[PDB]
Design a binder for this molecule. Structure first.
Ligand SMILES: [Mg+2]
Length: 261
């Protein structure tokens, strides 16, 4: 039976339309918590810019976090796994973005920065996703940092152009305007593995929930993967079950369907 739930944030817990968590989702997670489910966040975002979970956090419903696509995992105050990108690949991404004229976010363990933020950062991270403004630093400074995750604002075409300079990183994408880059093997699947290792939970007792391309590995890896109803077809194909759209009680309906609650 399911013992661990893994939830993506954007488009899974938090609506892109309201920037809020559906009421039925909060109710479902309260019910699951009381039944003893462990409830985990599994997001591409770094902790520093997770600014939209307060309704769950204030209710003390989250048992641990997979952040940065698996590159930074923690349970309470305890870090259980982290990674860093090979410096050559940080440098190559910085040089590429600066040459191309596109911005890039560089995330360290305890600092976050953006280089040359432009209309794409404003449009996508601030205006669309409601991320708080990230401090600016130069690409030269960024290129020298110990970086856990980079988020270049590159298209799929631009990604293929920089790819040979990025020979070992993982590149996770759910949206056409940016991708998240982490070190080899660091995907939300890795995050699941680290969390369940910590808790003594078997992979066969896991359930994941996602809407995006960066969820596909965790949708396949968990024993049961649930795709949100508005997800792209490749995300749905990776899942075992497709629930309703997020703003049509998709989380609650899935949890009820499986008897989680
Ligand atoms: Mg998502």
């Amino acid at each position: 039976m399911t013992k661990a739930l893994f939830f993506d944030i954007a488009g899974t817990l938090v609506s892109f339309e309201t920037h809020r968590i559906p009421s039925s989702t909060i109710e479902a997670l309260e019910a699951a918590h009381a039944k003893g489910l462990k409830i985990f966040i599994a997001t591409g975002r770094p902790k520093a810019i997770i600014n939209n979970l307060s309704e769950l956090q204030d209710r003390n419903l989250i048992d641990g976090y997979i952040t940065m696509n698996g590159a930074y995992c923690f349970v309470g105050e305890e870090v259980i796994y982290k990674s860093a990108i090979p410096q050559e690949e940080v440098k190559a991404m910085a040089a590429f973005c600066e040459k191309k004229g596109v911005p890039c976010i560089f995330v360290e363990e305890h600092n976050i920065s953006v280089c040359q933020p432009n209309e794409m950062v404003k449009k996508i991270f601030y205006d669309f996703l409601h991320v708080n403004v990230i401090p600016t630093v130069s690409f030269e400074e960024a290129s020298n940092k110990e970086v856990i995750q980079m988020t270049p604002f590159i298209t799929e075409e631009e990604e293929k152009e920089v790819l040979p300079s990025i020979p070992t990183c993982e590149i996770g994408r759910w949206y056409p305007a940016f991708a998240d880059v982490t070190a080899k093997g660091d995907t939300k699947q890795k995050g699941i593995d680290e969390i369940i290792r910590h808790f003594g939970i078997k992979l066969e007792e896991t359930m994941s929930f996602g809407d995006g391309g960066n969820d596909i590995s965790m949708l396949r890896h968990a024993a049961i993967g649930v795709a949100m109803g508005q997800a792209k077809e490749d995300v749905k194909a990776a899942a075992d079950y497709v629930t309703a759209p997020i703003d049509e009680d998709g989380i609650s309906k899935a949890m009820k369907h499986f008897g989680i609650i």
